[PDB]
């Protein structure tokens, strides 16, 4: 697969409910949901090595990882975690996360290139799943 690109959002579902499970309060959720509505997503892939930059007016994150090698990032609500990405299948990666400190919902994310050329991101906290779909700009 070729995840490389500058990706533009075309669908977002359940992001506020995700932040709810994670315990983000109402006014912060408003800030987050408004900013997350128009993110910029840059992905560079070389083999199983990835760079992913996700930018919004209120928070930007940059991660560098190799599939199968543990790395550190943050949960969507900003808590440090250890992450491990694996290929669930040829076109879908899945990331399991573990908090560095403390307790909280079990979090994960997935990114999949679909047969139509689009990119599906999911982010999960416990049972609640947020789905975002992108196409290259």
Ligand X SMILES: CC1=C(/C=C/C(C)=C/C=C/C(C)=C/C(=O)O)C(C)(C)CCC1
- Could you list the residues that contact ligand X (CB under 6 A)? 19, 24, 28, 31-32, 35-36, 39, 54, 56, 58-59, 76-78, 121, 132
CB of 47 to ligand X, least distance (A): 22
CB of residue 91 to Na ion, shortest distance in Å: 8
The tokens describing 90, both together, are 């040829």
**Cβ closest to ligand X, residue 33 vs residue 67:** 33
**Number of alpha helices (DSSP H) and beta strands (DSSP E) in the chain:** 2, 10
Nearest approach, Cβ of residue 99 and Na ion (Å): 30
Instruction: Give the three-state DSSP class for 41.
Output: strand
Q: What is the chain's percent helix, strand, coil content, to nearest 5? A: 15, 55, 30
Residue ranges that bind Na ion, judged by CB under 5 A: 90
């Amino acid at each position: 697969p070729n995840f490389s690109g500058n990706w533009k959002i075309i669908r977002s579902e359940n992001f506020e409910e995700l932040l709810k499970v994670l315990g983000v309060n109402v006014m912060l959720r408003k800030i987050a949901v408004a900013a997350a509505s128009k993110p910029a997503v840059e992905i560079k892939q070389e083999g199983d090595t990835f760079y992913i930059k996700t930018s919004t007016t209120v928070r930007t994150t940059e991660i560098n990882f190799k599939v199968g090698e543990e790395f550190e990032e943050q949960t969507v609500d900003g808590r440090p975690c250890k992450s491990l990405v694996k290929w669930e299948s040829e076109n879908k990666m899945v990331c399991e996360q573990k908090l560095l400190k403390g307790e909280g919902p079990k979090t994960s994310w997935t990114r999949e290139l679909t047969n139509d050329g689009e990119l599906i991101l999911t982010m999960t906290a416990d049972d609640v799943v947020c789905t975002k779909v992108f196409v290259r700009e």
